[PDB]
């Protein structure tokens, strides 16, 4: 399917939800944010991804950590749109779905802005992760 | 069928290019550009659009004309991304295909910028135009 550009940096390990998305729909939304987006993990049906950052708890020596945010979506929901704020990181997310504006995850949004529109909804996430998201890329349905 | 929000502006006149692509795949991407995209016109096929924008050459006393610019695709290669800046009109088009990521259409770049996937790749466009690119509407195969 279509996706997007790489939007971050080259450090973390790749990640790829391609397969997890087989088990369905994104259905949730799970973010860890503080002045920065931590960690990303999408629901796929009922089916979590891994979590997708905050490698260890050690890496508040790097970052704070933040939050827990949870985002469920309805049946028919699906995401629209996202503006990353991003360097050598992912900085900041914010969500839109066809139903919903959802809150930014990450307070900070001075890096660099990329809107990334998504008609008929993303399909799944692929990026870099460790201690942080190191970087993002959006996966449309076809 | 999916097709991206409304880019751009309130002016000109509508066009739909949907009975026209009954023709094909989009094979061809024409347009005329200066600091800014002043037309657009696609190849359905075998069979063009009309042209969408620099409807008059009088439209000089408002805004700069610019050259023409053809991009063939090859046989499957489809437009799976746009790089839109707007406001008021369309400024600059980025497009990119499957294959490769091809030259902006307008110089500058500096309205707001949205990237929109284009889900199984562009079908047509639809929009608004007049002496320029009034907006633009990307219909999806998906
Ligand atoms: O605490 C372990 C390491 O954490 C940081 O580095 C990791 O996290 C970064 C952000 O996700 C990645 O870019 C990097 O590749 C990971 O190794 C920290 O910078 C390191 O000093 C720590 O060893």
Redesign the pocket.
Same mark, same amino acid.
Request: with cysteine; net charge neutral; hydrophobic share 20%.
């Given at each position: 399917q279509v996706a997007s550009e790489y939007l971050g &940096?080259p &450090? &973390?390990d790749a990640f790829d939800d391609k397969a997890l998305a087989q088990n369905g729909d994104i259905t949730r939304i799970e973010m860890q944010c503080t002045d920065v987006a931590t960690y990303i993990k999408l629901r796929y049906g009922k089916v979590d991804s891994r979590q997708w &950052?905050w490698? /260890?708890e /050690?890496?508040i020596? =790097?970052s704070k950590k933040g939050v827990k945010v949870v985002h469920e979506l309805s049946s028919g929901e699906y995401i629209t749109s996202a503006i990353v704020t991003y360097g050598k990181?992912v900085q900041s997310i914010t969500f839109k779905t066809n139903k919903r504006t959802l809150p930014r995850c990450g307070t900070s949004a001075t890096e660099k802005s990329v809107t990334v529109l998504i008609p008929g909804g993303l399909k799944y996430i692929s990026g870099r =992760?460790?201690?942080?998201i190191?970087g993002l890329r959006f996966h449309a349905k076809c």
């Open positions: &940096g &450090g &973390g &950052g490698a /260890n /050690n890496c020596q =790097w990181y =992760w460790g201690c942080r190191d």
